[PDB]
A paper describes a structure:
Lysins (amidases, lysozymes/muramidases and peptidases) are such specialised bio-molecules. The term lysozyme, or muramidase, is broadly used to describe the enzymes that cleave the β-1,4-glycosidic bond between N-acetylglucosamine (NAG) and N-acetylmuramic acid (NAM) (or vice versa) in the carbohydrate backbone of peptidoglycan, Figure 1. Earlier reports had indicated the extraordinary stability of the digestive lysozyme from [name] at low pH, and the corresponding cDNA sequence (Genbank entry AAA73935.1) had been published. In addition, we have determined the crystal structure of the apo enzyme and of complexes with reaction products (chito-oligosaccharides). The structure presented here is the first to be determined for the avian upper-gut subset of GH22 lysozymes, and is, as expected, very similar overall to other C-type lysozymes.
Screening for ligand complexes was carried out with the supposed inactive mutants, E35A and D51A. Co-crystallisations of E35A were set up with chitobiose, chitotriose, chitotetraose, chitopentaose and chitohexaose, and were successful with chitobiose, chitotetraose, and chitohexaose. The resulting electron density clearly confirmed the Glu to Ala mutation. Unfortunately, there is no density in the +1 subsite—a key aim of the experiment had been to observe sugar bound across the point of catalysis between −1 and +1. It is evident that the mutant retains a sufficient level of residual activity to hydrolyse; at the high protein concentrations of a prolonged crystallization, the chitohexaose substrate to a mixture of the two, three and four membered sugars. The binding of the ligand in subsites −4, −3, −2 and −1 is typical for this family. Unfortunately, the “inactive” mutant retained sufficient activity to degrade longer oligosaccharide substrates, and so the complexes did not span the −1 and +1 sites as planned. However, the long active site cleft is accessible to ligand in the crystals, which may prove beneficial in future. Sites +1 and +2 do appear to be accessible in the structure, and binding of non-hydolysable chitohexaose analogues, for example, with sulphur replacing the glycosidic oxygens, might prove successful if such ligands should become available.
Residue numbers in the entry: -1 to 126
The structure:
């Protein structure tokens, strides 16, 4: 299914949630991260087989949320994965902040490492 958050709305949400400087990250980092993870879809979903990724930050069921169907899992954010599939980003924000605090940055997100880190991210934050 699809329920998009537009780019500039997400920018405002993240700025107003103190994401600038969180664990040394930038707003642009998080926008680029979302574009490559979920394509701005709050009910983005990917079932890789061993684990599933949920919501706008593509949070993984092996480590961070419980979906009841992932073998060898731990639930680091102490939430059901279905909490991460809604228009209400509060649970996504809380959990992503924990993930980034534990890693002291954005390396848990493969899209960010592969398509954002060390690049010119001006386009993701201009024009709002
Ligand atoms: C198919 C595909 O590419 N899927 C993508 C998803 O993989 C990706 O979700 C991210 O998945 C990785 C790999 O499982 C995951 O990274 C692991 O995270 C755990 C928990 O932090 C690490 O285990 C910890 O290691 C630390 C030090 O690194 C220890 O101190 C700690 O004690 C260990 N913790 C526990 C609880 O076991 C793993 O080492 C680490 N593995 C790797 C290879 O990095 C990320 O957290 C997942 N990210 C998110 C946001 O959930 C998803 C997002 O990129 O995108 C899919 O496409
Ligand atoms: Cl920025």
């Amino acid at each position: 299914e699809k329920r998009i958050i537009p780019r500039c709305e997400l920018v405002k949400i993240l700025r107003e949630h103190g994401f600038e400087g969180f664990e040394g990250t930038t707003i642009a980092d998080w926008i680029c991260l979302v574009q490559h993870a979920s394509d701005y879809n709050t009910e983005a979903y990917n079932n890789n087989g061993p684990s599933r990724d949920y919501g706008i930050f593509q949070i993984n069921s092996k480590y961070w949320c419980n979906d009841g169907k992932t073998s060898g899992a731990v639930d680091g954010c102490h939430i059901s994965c279905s909490e991460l599939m809604t228009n209400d980003l509060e649970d996504d924000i809380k959990c992503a902040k924990k993930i980034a605090r534990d890693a002291h940055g954005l390396t848990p997100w493969y899209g960010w490492k592969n398509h954002c880190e060390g690049r010119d991210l001006s386009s993701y934050v201009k024009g709002c």
